[PDB]
Structure 1
Amino acid sequence: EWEVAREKITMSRELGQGSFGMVYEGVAKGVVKDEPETRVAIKTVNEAASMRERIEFLNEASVMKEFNCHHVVRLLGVVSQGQPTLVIMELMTRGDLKSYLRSLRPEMENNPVLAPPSLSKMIQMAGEIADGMAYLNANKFVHRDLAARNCMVAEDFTVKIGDFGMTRDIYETDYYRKGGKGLLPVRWMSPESLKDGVFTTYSDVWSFGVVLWEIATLAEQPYQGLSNEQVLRFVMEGGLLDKPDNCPDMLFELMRMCWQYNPKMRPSFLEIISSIKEEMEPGFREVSFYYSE
């Protein structure tokens, strides 16, 4: 079904170190309808892994087999015969959103443009990110690590929901062992998740508000001036991120709606999209989950 000729897959270079194995970048022969070749991201499984691990790999991959959204990085077949287990996916040529935002900084430094930022561009990303998340939540899937570093940028600048899931030494401090038991993205977590360690769609929305803050600051780390333990106390007691410098008032208002203390009072991704859909580009209606059937 999704199994594909491993011979029809040629790895080029490396993108990063995955959990089950190194992640490469290459091309696939006939993996997309009406397409000869296709740039893709190759996910592998180090031979130094038993079946207890190998099977787990194809377990989480079968989860994506049910996903089909313009705003979520799509799966493209899988390999697991007479060679190392592999999984193929749509390749996002501009990388993750945090790196992309960060790479814009130098330009903006020596760029002779003293004009406010484009609210229009930020809304496009917001809606694409919110549309991909609405789709995921609709399929009873909670992300648990929504952050700019886990959003991907396409060649055409479209943003899609993914999960970097690779080494990344530059974002290691984005995680903290709240209680030893695993690395958690504490600066992106809601008050309730910081307490019981439970993630829901309500908390994905809180994280969404933080991603909007990341976009407006060109990915500065949330809660400047506070250590991890200080962030914990501050957020759990009702503290909130500050309005970014030169942030369109409308964007911050959206953020604040995402950061209400009472989880049940936060709007859902569908409500978020409904309140900004009239600001979305024309094409949005064509390929978005929101307008779909």
Structure 2
Amino acid sequence: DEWEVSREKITLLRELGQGSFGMVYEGNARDIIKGEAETRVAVKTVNESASLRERIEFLNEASVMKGFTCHHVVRLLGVVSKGQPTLVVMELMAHGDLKSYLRSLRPEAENNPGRPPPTLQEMIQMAAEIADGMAYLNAKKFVHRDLAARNCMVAHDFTVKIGDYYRKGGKGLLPVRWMAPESLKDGVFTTSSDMWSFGVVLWEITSLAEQPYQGLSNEQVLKFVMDGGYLDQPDNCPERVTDLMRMCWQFNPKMRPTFLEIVNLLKDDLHPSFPEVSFFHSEENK
């Protein structure tokens, strides 16, 4: 409602890549945040191949995001809903998705930015931020359903946030290699099966985003995990992250931690700013 922004305040710089509804652009937004003359933004658009239904759904999803104020979830900044084209204006995440970011710190990487792979301190900070954002989503009664490094984003200051590979199935496409065994079985998704996928994200973080279950076909992964298999620990993985993975990969979903529980385990070794920005420490959790 008060989220409307004049189309004329958005300038578009360059393509960021295809999103679910259309091309996402990097841009600038004039006078969109009090105290900032100009804000780097991501700008979501919808293909002209969209049905009227998809255009209406594109805007309805932005409406849902108006209810979200969490430092560790990529936030909506504004909507262009009057006239066409329509634009959903998001916080810019200048280091892109977490999978591409991880692969770029591999020693072999052509786009290596000349810094070493993540430290233990950096990996625990990442884990806490992702879990804090997921805890927020869960309090808002949303099951993510698709947690994976590809759907986590990295900010200019390297904060990780929840953003917004697949086999066909009876209810839609399934991210088989990130799915809990009970989801492979009946196709139900819960915060507990989200906690499974969180463990896979920690595995991607500690493997610099190798492909989970490489060398296994989608059909074999589905049987391996349903039987009780799980990923092997990457070489020289810190014990502390290995212990998180083991919690996440309990076969019984009832024995997995909650996202608030993850942040509690990690809270004492975080950047000093974390209690200032986290959902965990906020009065919305107290």
Give the TM-score of the pair, scaled to structure 2.
0.93
Q: Any conservation in 1 of the 2:105–2:117 contact (CA below 8 Å)?
A: no
Name 1:30's counterpart in structure 2. 31
TM-fit CA distance, 1:162: 0.3
What number of residue pairs does the alignment pair up? 279
Q: Structure 2: which amino acid aligns with 1:187?
A: R
Pairs within 5 Å for 1:133-212: 133-163=134-164, 174-177=165-168, 179=169, 182-212=172-202
TM-fit CA distance, 1:48: 3.6
TM-fit CA distance, 1:195: 1.2
Name 1:91's counterpart in structure 2. 92
3-state SS of 2:173 partner:
coil
Give the TM-score of the pair, scaled to structure 1.
0.91
Distance 1:126 1:49, change over 3 A: same
Q: Any conservation in 2 of the 1:46–1:84 contact (CA below 8 Å)?
A: no
Q: Any conservation in 1 of the 2:195–2:248 contact (CA below 8 Å)?
A: yes
115-124 or 82-91, which moves further after superposition?
115-124
Q: Any conservation in 2 of the 1:116–1:246 contact (CA below 8 Å)?
A: no
CA-based RMSD of the aligned residues comes to: 1.9
3-state SS of 1:71 partner:
coil
Post-superposition Cα deviations, 1:177-212, rounded to whole Å, max 9, x if no partner, equal 2x3653211000000111111211001101000000
CA distance in 2, matches of 1:18, 1:240: 30
Structure 2 residue runs of 5 or longer lacking an equivalent are: none
TM-fit CA distance, 1:51: 2.7
Name 1:248's counterpart in structure 2. 238
Q: Any conservation in 1 of the 2:131–2:263 contact (CA below 8 Å)?
A: yes
Q: Any conservation in 2 of the 1:117–1:246 contact (CA below 8 Å)?
A: no
TM-fit CA distance, 1:44: 0.9
CA distance in 2, matches of 1:259, 1:3: 43
CA distance in 1, matches of 2:233, 2:44: 39
Deviating beyond 4 angstroms after TM superposition, the runs of 4 or more aligned structure 1 residues are: none
Structure 1 residue runs of 5 or longer lacking an equivalent are: 164-173
Q: Structure 2: which amino acid aligns with 1:236?
A: M
TM-fit CA distance, 1:108: 7.6
Q: Which residue of the other structure, out of 275, 280, 283, is the alignment partner of 1:285?
A: 275
CA distance in 1, matches of 2:36, 2:137: 27
